[PDB]
Design a protein around this ligand. Structure first.
Ligand code: FAD
Ligand code: FES
Ligand code: FES
Lengths: 1292, 99, 50, 50
């Protein structure tokens, strides 16, 4: 009966009889046609959908701005609020906001998909702090992820707002004018002033929605429907609605109630309302801790500590304090702190008040200590701490912030009257069970003792017995979680014993001098310096200048149309998939009865509904689209649901009942695949290795496992397929790298010639090799459904769907046997490569692995073999580097292992085995490593290595629980394809009679700025400004037979083709230009038309020569080589497992950089993307082959907190390639292994100090789980281990 | 091409020109329409010479393509048009041309 | 280079779809750009002959 | 199945444009009243020469 009223970008939005299940993000895109707000992960952890919510409090007569993730906001909770998006703060046709101008001109945009989320977070903070500090801007960006830029240029644009040769002119930016910001909608200000007390009712055939605005009415609705939840920020029940299958028919969402948002400063403590956001709570707590004595602000400091690492700024501004308490998440960062300090909950019912204490039985949800279903939570009381009362909190996750904790804790102790006896003790642990638990029995048996090491050792063995984790505990990391429970107890014993030493120095002893570092927290500060070249060239020649990405400001204003950003075409249908839920089973039955009858369902297709066109051959062996009778991995396509809307599609997909029968064997690991026919072998040999194994001093055998990786492109798999209605013509609009492949698989599926199926790609929001084979499979069945029903079909996958259907990087296993002498030189090296290929096969990864395994080391006697292994996991795809980040790591791991057996640092072993200036590769190709040795020497001097190596050794000898590490690796990245026909590129250039030029080519813009570089080529070869040239996109209707747009040579090859078409046109026009050199380009093209001169031309480059005889093992497959070196420094926490990237120094040989701004961004992004591959990015698989994606098992990519605090990049000064340039987008990924060995060196320093000589086999990724378990101590051997065969683990 | 189909069957005559100059059935050739994004600076499609003039331009592009493919056609005169275009791609022969 | 024109087929023209058609397309694209929406203009027979 | 120009599917949020034409063969425009027409349902904009 009620209406919905709110504002978006100043325009009024009225909605009559709304579906209460409607979320803000799909409403902005599908109903308001505001495609700037993007979809990233749907869980609220990416920040791609960041918007600004604005409310007016009529009591304070002030407006409150706060950011929020639109993908979790129901629109019924926005009554009277004003939403602001990217399009609202500015656009190209009106005024560009300085936030949009600076984040784009600082080259902080590559693919540009995450940019709208970055812009809104920066804009919202500048609306709350017009003169901010960099600390405030980085904390706002803590909830925003990016896969391309590495966060460095976004920080540079943020520094522009602070009153604290370059790639951008900061002096030309608009000063942030605070006078002409967006005014708050005055209609809402009048609405709030009239405190209407009527509750609003929104309903549909599925759900009713009640928004009481008075406390009296709210208590009435909570009594009518006790089971109905009380939605506040929707950050706990929202995510459960999507992926956890929960559904609530009744929903209560109170508006701003004055009784629910109370903050009072009492005498015994403070009481905070349950309606306050966690961001507001930290603001009143950060205010009181600098106003009150430190003896009473003990509890609030522990809360402020974890509220700083509590998710991101958007989720903190949505989640409520009461919602956090009632949610009772097992991995809660705030419940263990509140449980140990006698907190009470002010419950209010319709019958009367009630006050229960927040204790153990409440968090365990015992009904006696819980809330009655009729009463709400109004406020919580947090008392002041007393003298000689001390409380501390701890946590540990995959990264420092915006990551669910593996194990966190809160501990409070009380002595009283100033003597070292404990009178009260209360400790709690989270992430160790289904609910937050307190060791009430352990704290009981310890009351009365003194603070000392003799008590602590009995406190451990007592706690370890009480809080027990079975070997099969969910979340995995059981041996890691057992240690974090002890280590937090050790850090707590160290902290409060230091507080006693500061207050009563005479009675208590001073702590151990080598133990003080354990109390310091690894907290960041972000500095960056970039060096590159910058006379005798025309000033209108744009080659070599840091030109901004053409779609840069379009990325910043949301006007950049991505695939799903395309307007909904008439009568289009949505297609969702149901995927396999077993890793290896037989499909015994598929029940489509209930799903076919559901609303909106048009058709559901299984394997039999495709008949003969269920298989396409990728020129090795045919792979099937939909599963037939068996499934071979989880996430394999089984059915395709086709419905009128996206929502109705997934609903029917969840009602498809599929029965299975598991099969044997269930192959998961590499070795499990090696146990079971014939496998195509590949090998290269140099010299004789068997003869060298008898003339070397030592022989070292070793191996290293390496985990996989997810592409995690910010734009998930998206495509729209539109039949024309004539001659079965079909236009596909796909986010892909290989439009020709999409054209082939769709034409083959539809049994049509290629000339009837065209493929159009304007831009892709990141790809990294993950948008080819699986994307064509989805487009095949999507076009099949489109042609069958004569309608346009759109298929966009969610994040959870995407990671499960798409593969990723190939997990590697490298066995090696190295013959070497004591001087560090390696003579004999036998190598075996193994790649976890997945369900289907992959040879090219093994090939490029063996050819690039040598890196910058001349192995005189080398034998290298490789294989690919079928497993019951999703089939992986080629990534950045094409196997190089794996083949070069196992050699560096080998070099590090012989350095331990030789006693020399790994850096000395690397330089001893390095190539000479002129040398020969294992495949008998000569190299000129003159730039290779020069990169190593300048990186040593630029980073001041030896001065920092001795300082790190000084730190390791002075500190016991904190260690530092330092490492430097060289880089030789060979660039080349298989044959000349694979490097072939084409282009098409038009010149209109007004002088303007339209160019198109076979390359795909994925963020590497290929289009920007092509316009730079047109500008030089035709002597016209780029403003005269324009490019729309890539289409098979213009440039046929285009090669895949993946790798380093995409811009190089297409740059030569565009250069060929411009020269062809320029030669036809030479008579006209010579006879009138003063005239413009307009009268040149006009007289060309008058003289019958053709102004259209095709560009073409046949490709670089490339050959390789894989039988002999010799060949010339690489056009050029990219050289470089990287040096990284790390400080690790020995107790927790935490680490901090301190400094990284990168030098690269790019030659003549065609665009130094774009090329440096690719170096940073490749390094950060590689850094995550070796440190934090971890894929958790179950023993049944099911990928875990909820809780501490969540996949995490590098954030801002993970970027090194100091980053230095220098481009080595400088002809077969275009303009003497070098493609380099895949090089820096391996340079991200410098931090891996920096952590490896620091772990060695902790093992050497404690005397633990032996095999330090650290596998990739070097997660905090592997870091801490390598630093063995008394707590390591104290944990209760489990026997291997008793329990079925949660992971591995 | 730059011609506009107004009922004079200009498109039909062009496919007849492709069929003769490339020695392939019309079923192999297809045309979608006219667009300034493909053929720039096209003249007005009105009068008697619309098909004649555009027929000579389509004939010029087919001859340009047929000459690039003469080494491949002579070395395999029995093969179809599919393996001709495939080996042209393998030998780095440009299969697009402007008439 | 920013304005492209696409014509698949015309149901008869005879010279009457040039100068006046461009005038209609001029003001139709002007209205389309001003309001940021797609605009369709189809004349009735009586409108057309006039 | 031959798609002509107006046979193209209605694109999202598209607007329609109609013209008012002269009713005199040679006269002077003394006034143009767009008041009543601008307020009518569905009207987005009315453009004159200025
Ligand atoms: C991306 C993301 C990252 C996160 N990271 C972390 C982290 O790092 N550490 C951590 O500890 N947590 C984390 N969380 C969880 C988050 O802290 C909680 O979900 C949040 O605090 C709950 O508050 P809410 O407003 O969303 O409650 P809601 O989602 O609105 O509701 C949840 C439950 O609480 C009930 N409820 C709400 N208010 C009341 C009230 N007055 N009275 C009675 N019942 C009420 C509701 O009935 C409902 O049943 C994260 C969540 C997301 C989405
Ligand atoms: S953060 Fe809202 S979509 Fe990922
Ligand atoms: S996500 Fe920022 S550009 Fe790819």
């Amino acid at each position: 009966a009620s209406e919905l009223l709110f504002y978006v970008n100043g325009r009024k939005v009225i909605e009559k009889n709304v579906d209460p299940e409607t979320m803000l993000l799909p409403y902005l895109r599908k109903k308001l046609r505001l495609t700037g707000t993007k979809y990233g992960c749907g869980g609220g952890g990416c920040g791609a959908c960041t918007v600004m919510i604005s409310r007016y409090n009529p009591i304070t007569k002030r407006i409150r701005h706060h950011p929020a993730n639109a993908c979790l906001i129901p629109i019924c909770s926005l009554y009277g609020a004003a939403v602001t998006t990217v399009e609202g703060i500015g656009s190209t046709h009106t005024r560009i906001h300085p936030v949009q101008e600076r984040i784009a001109k600082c080259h902080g945009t590559q693919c540009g998909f995450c940019t709208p989320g970055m812009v809104m977070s920066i804009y919202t903070l500048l609306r709350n702090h017009p003169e901010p500090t960099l600390d405030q801007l980085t904390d706002a960006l803590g909830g925003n992820l990016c896969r391309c830029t590495g966060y460095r240029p976004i920080i540079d644009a943020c520094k522009t707002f602070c009153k604290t040769p370059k790639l951008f002119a900061e002096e030309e930016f608009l000063p942030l004018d605070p006078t002409q910001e967006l005014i708050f909608p005055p209609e809402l200000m009048i609405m709030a002033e009239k405190q209407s007390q009527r509750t609003r009712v929104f309903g549909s055939e599925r759900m009713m929605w009640f928004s009481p605005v008075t406390l009296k009415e709210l208590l009435e609705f909570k009594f009518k429907y006790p089971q109905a939840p009380v939605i506040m920020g929707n950050t706990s029940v929202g995510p459960e609605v999507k992926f956890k299958g929960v559904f609530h028919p009744v929903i209560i969402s109170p508006d701003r109630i004055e009784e629910l948002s109370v903050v009072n400063h009492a005498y015994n403590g403070l009481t905070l309302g349950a309606g306050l956001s966690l961001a507001q709570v930290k603001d009143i707590l950060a205010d009181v801790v600098q106003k009150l004595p430190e003896e009473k602000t003990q509890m609030y400091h522990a809360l402020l500590k974890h509220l700083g690492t509590l998710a991101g700024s958007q989720i903190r501004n949505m989640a409520s304090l009461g919602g956090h308490i009632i949610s009772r998440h097992p991995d809660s960062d705030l419940n263990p702190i509140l449980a140990v300090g006698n907190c009470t909950l002010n419950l209010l019912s319709k019958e009367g008040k009630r006050q229960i204490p927040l204790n153990e039985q409440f968090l365990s949800k015992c009904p006696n200590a819980d809330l009655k279903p009729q009463e709400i939570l109004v406020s919580v009381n947090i008392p002041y701490s007393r003298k000689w009362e001390f409380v501390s909190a701890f946590r540990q996750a995959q990264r420092q912030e915006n990551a669910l904790a593996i194990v966190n804790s809160g501990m409070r102790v009380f002595f009283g009257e100033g003597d070292g006896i404990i009178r009260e003790l209360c400790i709690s642990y989270g992430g160790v069970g289904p609910a937050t638990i307190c060791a009430k029995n352990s704290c009981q048996k310890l009351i009365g003792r003194h603070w000392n090491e003799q008590m602590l050792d009995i406190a451990c063995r007592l706690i370890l017995n009480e809080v027990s984790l079975l070997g099969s505990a969910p979340g995995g990391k059981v041996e890691f979680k057992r240690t974090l429970i002890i280590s937090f107890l050790f850090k707590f014993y160290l902290e409060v014993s230091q507080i006693l030493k500061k207050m009563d120095p005479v009675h208590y002893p001073s702590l151990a001098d080598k133990y003080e570092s354990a109390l310091e927290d690894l907290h960041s500060h972000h500095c960056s310096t970039l060096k590159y070249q910058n006379p005798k060239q025309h000033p209108e020649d744009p080659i070599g200048h840091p030109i901004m990405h053409l779609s840069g400001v379009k990325h910043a204003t949301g006007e950049a149309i991505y695939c799903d950003d395309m307007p909904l075409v008439d009568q289009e249908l949505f297609l969702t998939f149901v995927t396999s839920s077993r890793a290896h089973a037989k499909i015994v039955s598929i029940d489509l009865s209930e799903a076919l009858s559901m609303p909106g369902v048009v058709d559901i297709m299984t394997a039999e509904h495709l008949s003969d066109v269920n298989s396409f051959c990728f020129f090795t062996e045919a792979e099937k689209f939909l599963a037939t009778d068996k499934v071979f991995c989880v996430g394999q396509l089984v059915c395709a649901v086709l419905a009128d809307s996206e929502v109705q599609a997934k609903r029917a997909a969840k009602r498809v009942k599929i029965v299975y029968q598991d099969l044997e064997p269930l192959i998961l690991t590499i070795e499990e695949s090696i146990q079971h026919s014939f496998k195509p072998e590949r090998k290269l040999e140099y010299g004789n290795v068997d003869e060298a194994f008898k003339v070397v001093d030592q022989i070292l055998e070793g191996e290293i496992h390496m985990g996989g990786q997810e592409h995690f492109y910010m734009e998930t798999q998206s495509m729209l397929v539109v039949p024309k209605g004539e001659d079965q013509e079909m236009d596909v609009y796909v986010s892909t790298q290989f439009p020709k492949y999409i054209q082939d698989i769709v034409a083959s599926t539809l049994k049509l010639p290629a000339n009837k199926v065209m493929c159009h790609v304007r831009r892709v929001g990141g790809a990294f090799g993950g948008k080819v084979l699986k994307t064509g499979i989805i487009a095949a069945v999507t076009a099949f459904a489109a042609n069958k029903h004569g309608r346009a079909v759109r298929c966009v996958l969610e994040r959870g769907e995407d990671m499960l259907i798409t593969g990723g990087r190939h997990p590697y296993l490298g066995k090696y046997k190295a013959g070497f002498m004591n001087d560090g030189r390696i003579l004999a090296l036998d190598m075996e490569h193994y790649s976890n290929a997945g369900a289907s096969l992959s040879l090219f990864v093994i090939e490029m692995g063996l050819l690039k395994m040598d890196n910058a080391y001349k192995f005189p006697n080398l034998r290298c073999r490789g294989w690919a292994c079928r497993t019951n996991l999703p089939s992986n795809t080629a990534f950045r580097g094409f196997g190089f980040p794996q083949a070069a790591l196992i050699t560096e791991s080998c070099i590090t292992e012989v350095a331990a057996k030789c006693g020399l640092s790994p850096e000395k072993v690397r330089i001893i085995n390095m190539y000479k200036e002129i040398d020969q590769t294992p495949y008998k190709q000569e190299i000129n490593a003159k730039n290779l040795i020069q990169c190593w020497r300048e990186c040593m001097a630029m980073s001041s290595y030896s001065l920092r190596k001795v300082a790190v050794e000084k730190f390791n000898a002075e500190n016991y629980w904190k260690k530092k590490g330092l490492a430097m690796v060289p880089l030789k990245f060979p660039v080349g394809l298989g044959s000349r026909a694979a490097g072939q590129a084409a282009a098409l250039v038009h010149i209109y009679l007004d002088g303007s030029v339209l160019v198109t080519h076979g390359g795909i813009e994925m963020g590497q700025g290929v289009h920007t570089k092509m316009i730079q080529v047109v500008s030089r070869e035709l002597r016209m400004p780029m403003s005269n040239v324009h490019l729309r996109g890539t289409s098979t209707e213009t440039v046929p037979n285009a090669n895949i747009s993946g790798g380093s040579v995409v811009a190089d090859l297409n740059g030569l083709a565009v250069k060929d078409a411009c020269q062809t046109l320029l030669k036809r026009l030479e008579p006209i230009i010579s006879k009138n050199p003063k005239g413009t380009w307009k009268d040149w093209a006009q007289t060309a038309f008058d003289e019958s001169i053709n102004l259209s031309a095709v560009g073409y480059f046949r490709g670089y020569e490339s050959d390789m005889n894989w039988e002999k093992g010799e060949g010339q497959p690489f056009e050029y080589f990219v050289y470089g070196a990287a040096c990284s420094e790390v400080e690790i926490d020995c107790l927790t497992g935490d680490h901090k990237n301190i400094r990284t120094d990168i030098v690269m040989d790019v030659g003549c950089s065609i665009n130094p701004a774009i090329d440096i961004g690719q170096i940073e992004g490749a390094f950060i993307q590689g850094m995550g591959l070796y440190t934090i990015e971890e894929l958790n698989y179950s023993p049944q082959g099911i990928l875990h994606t909820r809780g501490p098992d969540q996949y995490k990519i590098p954030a801002i907190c993970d970027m090194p605090t100091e980053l230095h990049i220098a481009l080595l000064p400088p002809s077969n390639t275009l303009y003497s340039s070098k493609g380099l987008r895949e090089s820096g990924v391996f340079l991200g292994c410098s931090v891996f060995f920096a952590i490896h060196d620091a772990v060695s320093a902790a093992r050497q100090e404690r005397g633990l000589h032996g095999p330090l086999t650290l596998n990739s990724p070097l997660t905090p789980e592997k870091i801490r378990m390598a630093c063995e101590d008394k707590f390591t051997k104290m944990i209760p281990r489990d026997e291997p065969g008793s329990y079925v683990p949660w992971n591995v």
